[PDB]
Every structure is written in C-alpha cells, then in structure tokens.
Design an enzyme around this catalytic site. Structure first.
Site, PDB file in Angstrom:
ATOM      1  N   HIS A  15      54.123  43.571  40.586  1.00  0.00           N
ATOM      2  CA  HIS A  15      53.174  43.762  41.695  1.00  0.00           C
ATOM      3  C   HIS A  15      52.824  45.229  42.012  1.00  0.00           C
ATOM      4  CE1 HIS A  15      53.389  39.499  42.354  1.00  0.00           C
ATOM      5  NE2 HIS A  15      54.666  39.543  42.716  1.00  0.00           N
ATOM      6  N   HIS A 128      59.255  39.917  47.100  1.00  0.00           N
ATOM      7  CA  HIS A 128      58.266  38.936  46.676  1.00  0.00           C
ATOM      8  C   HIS A 128      56.932  39.306  47.330  1.00  0.00           C
ATOM      9  CE1 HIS A 128      56.580  35.017  45.509  1.00  0.00           C
ATOM     10  NE2 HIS A 128      56.209  34.814  46.762  1.00  0.00           N
TER      11      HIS A 128
END
Lengths: 133, 133, 133, 133
Positions: A15, A128
């Site tokens: 990410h 996350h």
C-alpha cells in the site's frame, strides 16, 4: 501475509509506493505471495511516516472490516494508484492483468502496536488499508 | 529544565501525577530545581501514555507560547490538581506555599521528538504543558 | 534529483526496497528520470526508518564523496540487491539491462537536515547512499 | 490494590518514581491506602515505559512469589530508593518513619495482560515488583 514480513512491512509492500509502475507490473510484487491474484489493491503515493500520523487520528469503526475498531481516517487526501483485476479467469498469477485508476483520496487504516522486528521509530503502525474515501 | 532529566522526563515530573500530595508538598519536587518558586503548576492525574496520545491530535498554535505551533489539544478532560503560589514574598524555596485547586479540564501540550535517552516506546513526547481549558 | 521528490524521498526511490524486482525491471523506476542509464545502483532491503536511525551513528568522512563529512555507517549489515549495467551502449533507457548481485553488507549514508516537506518525525534524513562495505 | 487504580497504575504508584522525596514522605502516598504501614518498598527511578519493555524479557519463576512464572528481569540495573520501616509499633500511619537506602540494582517484575482501562499501547504491563537483584 508472508512470514518474511511483519504486518507493517506487508502493509508497506501492498500500500505504500511513491512512484509505482503500472498496475500489471506493480501487482506482481504482491501476487507472487498469493495463491490467486488479488481482486483489487490501492497503492498510496505517500511515505510511511505520513501513514503513521493517521494512526494517531481518532479511532473509528473499520468501514470494510466492521468487527474492528482500530481504524483511523486520514485528515488529508493523498495521490494514489488503484489497481483492479480485469482477468479473474486466467491461468497463472503471472498472467494477471489490472486496470489502472490513479486518483487522490482520503484513506482509512487499521493500526496496531509494532512487531519487535519493526523499527522502534514507530511503536504504532498501519497494518491494513481498510478503504479509501 | 535540570540536566538530570530529558524534556519528556521533566514534563512528567512537573505535570504527570496519578495521586499527588497537596500542592505545598508536591511543589517542593519542582522548586528544589529552581532559583525561585514557580508561580503556578498543574499536575494532570493521568498516565504518560494518555498524554502521548494527545501528541497525535491535530497540531495547533500554542495558546500561551504563540511562537510555537507544535501544540495539541486533548480530546477529553482529565482530573488534575492546579497549584497557585500564595506567598511570592518569602525567604526560601523551602517556605513556598500553594493553594490547591483540584479540577477536571482539557489540556494543551507541545510535543517534540524524543531524546535518545527517552524510552523508544514514545518517539513523540510531550515537552511542555502549555495550558488547560 | 527530480523536483517532485525531496532528497530523502529520492534517496528512498533509489535505495530503499524491501522486495525489489530483478535489476533490469527495478532500474526502470530510476532510469525513467535520466537520459543515460545509471551505471550501478544498490537497493537496500530495509525501511526508511531504519536508515534514519543510521543517521544518528558517528559522523564520518564519506568514502566516495570525500569532500563531505556527514556520512554514517550502519552498525549491522542489511540484505540488498546491487544492480550493474551490462549494456552501456543502449540507445533507449527502456533497453538497459542489469546484472543482479544480491548481497548483504553494511551501508554508508550521507544525512542532512530534513526538507520542510519531509515529516517532522525525522529532523535528519539520509540523502545519498555513499557506498556499502 | 485500591480500586480507583488498575494493577499497572498501582504498580506505578508504589514502584515508579523518577525523583522521590525521602522515604518517610514518599511512603505516605502508599500507606494512606493501608491500616498498617508497609514494611518495605522499593521505588525504581525510571519510567513506566522502561518497565513495560522489561515485560518483553524472558519469562522466569518469580523469586519471591514462586507460584508464579510471569516474572521478567531487567537487562540493566536502575537507580532506585529502597525504604525500610523503622518504627513498626506506629499507631497512626502518618507517624511511620522509614530508613532510606538509595541504590542501583536489576529488577524483577511480574507482568500480565493489561486492564481494558490501561492504554492499548501496552498489551502487557507490570503489576508487581517481585524483588531486586
């Protein structure tokens, strides 16, 4: 997550990318560790420290994983690259292909205490990418 | 600040106290390091980790030290003990006396990166109690 | 350095990669910003935070840029990928090909005060990979 | 333990003090919560964060509470103040008097899962000072 990576590290690999290649190339990095290709993935074009800053924002319900309430919404948008699998019917992970959707959005992360192997610079780390707004 | 303490440590000595004694006693701890008695001092009845949490709140102008913009306002009030010098005309630091004002308020801290000697658990630490609200 | 990156960021693009693809792929990320393919480049398989911690090590003369005395050696070796250009005739940067030299060495970085746009979490940042040992 | 404190907090009140006053003053903070003055007590001149880091050291049998196996020794000595009651006849706790024994030793703490009201920054916290070495 592969055992070669802490949760924070795996978060960064999936990410965080200041200048990723196009999605079809960028996604190999991830899909090599997977049984099947990932349906979707957003790379934030920012730095890990900026994401850590979001970890200190007000704790919220995670929008996409609603059993968790260790999520945090960014106060500012970041440029990003969103990748969408466009050939889910396909032979190898090596053949997965993605549509590219560059954008700029707020993001929401779940954060947790760091792994012992993570840098002491960040005792609280994103683990996350819950969603983007 | 005394050199025996990092800024974070000196912050804790002046401003963090789960159960302080009455102001006249509590203030000796501080005034022993000073040339003259401190005019006023608030002890927050909370934990250092809770104050670190405030360091991740939105950065604001410091209300009482307006050249700084590394301040942060707490999202919640904490119980506290406010001490006010009531005998500024007085011989020794050992004779300073304080009025006691227990209360519950929001607080504003200036935060900075930790000293190398500070625990790696908090890379960002409160270094000054700017005011209470 | 491209101007859309601070020095610290450009350092990260060139030299920080937890899981780089093979050199011939990895180097495109750098060579797109050049007329001529880079002759060599080392990717450190670590995180930026780890490198910033090396900025706090003893300052030494930079071995490959000896006019500078703001270099810092890592206390420990890190895994890395060294890339060596194998076809320097190459007309188009897309055609440059690299040999791969995975390895594990100490690193030496030059560090400077951060750019205002770099996180205040790191007042000092790595700006050049000077050499590996 | 008084109920207005979690175990971790009560541990801090009894055993964590960067700059304690002399024992006869320092012990009042503890003895106000008792009918009988505490026979002995050690104040560690360190921070709670430092102790929490010792919770991550090897688990060992607690030397003074041998039914437990959740104790952890510090890797390094810390400065401390040991207090020994010198007038155990004392009718009123306000009249208890202590000898002072400044020192520098390793410490052994029992650690347990945090109370829900303790910061999520420390999933494991010290709850008893088992002994010093």
């Amino acid at each position: 997550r592969p055992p070669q990576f802490t949760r924070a590290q795996w978060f960064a690999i999936q990410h965080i990318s200041l200048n990723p290649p196009r999605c079809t190339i960028a996604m190999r990095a991830i899909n090599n560790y997977r049984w099947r290709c990932k349906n979707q993935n957003t790379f934030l074009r920012t730095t890990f420290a900026n994401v850590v800053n979001v970890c200190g924002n007000q704790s919220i319900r995670c929008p996409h994983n609603r059993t968790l309430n260790n999520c945090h919404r960014s106060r500012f948008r970041v440029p990003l690259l969103h990748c969408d699998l466009i050939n889910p019917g396909a032979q190898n992970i090596s053949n997965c292909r993605y549509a590219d959707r560059p954008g700029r959005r707020f993001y929401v992360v779940a954060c947790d205490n760091r792994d012992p192997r993570d840098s002491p610079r960040y005792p609280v780390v994103p683990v996350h990418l819950d969603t983007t707004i």
